[PDB]
Design a protein around this ligand. Sequence first.
Ligand SMILES: [Zn+2]
Length: 444
Amino acid sequence: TQTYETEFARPLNEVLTDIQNRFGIRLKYDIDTVGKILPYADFRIRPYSVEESLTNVLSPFDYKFVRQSGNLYKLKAYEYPRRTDADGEKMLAYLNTLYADKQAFELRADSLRKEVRQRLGIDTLLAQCVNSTPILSKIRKFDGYTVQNFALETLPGLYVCGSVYTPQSKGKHALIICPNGHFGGGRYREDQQQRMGTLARMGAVCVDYDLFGWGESILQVGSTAHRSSAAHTIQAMNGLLILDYMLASRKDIDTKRIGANGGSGGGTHTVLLTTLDDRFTASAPVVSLASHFDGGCPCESGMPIQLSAGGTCNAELAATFAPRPQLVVSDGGDWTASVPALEFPYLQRIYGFYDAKDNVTNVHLPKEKHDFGPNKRNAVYDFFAEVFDLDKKMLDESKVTIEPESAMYSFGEKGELLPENAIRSFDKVAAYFDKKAFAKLKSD
Ligand SMILES: [Zn+2]
């Protein structure tokens, strides 16, 4: 019954099936429309445009479409971290109106650094971090580099576990902090060991560490806890405390050569690190950078850092590092497809404010997909070789050992070495962020 008096109301699932048949498209559904009723459904249709029709029937339920290949469309929930290339181009054009030189750029960059840090809440948690003796494994020797595991206590009872990759070559070394993306196996994976081992053979101390609720963090908080705003703050805190610990505990580091490098989520965390800490002298965010995507995981976008200074994006945060050497690796199979046309020229103009366009580079892999495969690693090897004066003759992944996973563990094959004091539920961490969690906890 289509009447004025029943608001010409149709179930949304009938409307969309009807759009699919009428305009001859295919729909992939990543939403469940059960029970959804759209008033005036047929009046929202536009015979000349499948896209207006879809947007007019979906935006009332907070849904959208994303055009796939050919005549296929995916139907999605609104995503606060994800916009379009078009949104990107308007954002970056808008931010270009806020600065015409170094002076104007540098005032906004300082506001961006302060408001990002404030909005992350990291200084609240740093004021509560302890100073206990880090748990260090024995040093394991390999061809031209060694590996040593660490567990560093942050908040009372909370541990970040990682591994340090040290060159065997004599003399002062570069240091590279290496947050990782959501790739299978985390920092334990083959391509992560390859990259840390090659950079260490070439003369860089390299450090990698568990994402919150990955690896041995699972022993304390479980796997679910990773997708939380807590993860965003805790992972940035982890990076900073690890940089502090490396610089205070080691004699072999040249403080003119401190790098950040990571892939996907690790590339988002790389930009966060160079935004939070002025000690970094070079940066390589890999298959990560976009004006129009902030990161899909709450560990990347869970805190509202992109609302800093009236609105920013990871491309502008990356720009605040100017004019320090920075490599952006992009590919044609993900959100970084835009970088050669959009994000890179934006970064070139800002590096331009310092006569240092040559300090920022883009290795675009048009044919490749979202991974940390060999040509991603080769752009990283090449960049740090160049800017940190590392030894390219040592570059050979066949010489890196692929340790089994448990060899990088701090707390034993089965986590049986997990300290007495140690947090064993997410509740203990959540209580720093949410009064509901604190209240659950305080009723023993
Ligand atoms: Zn994450």
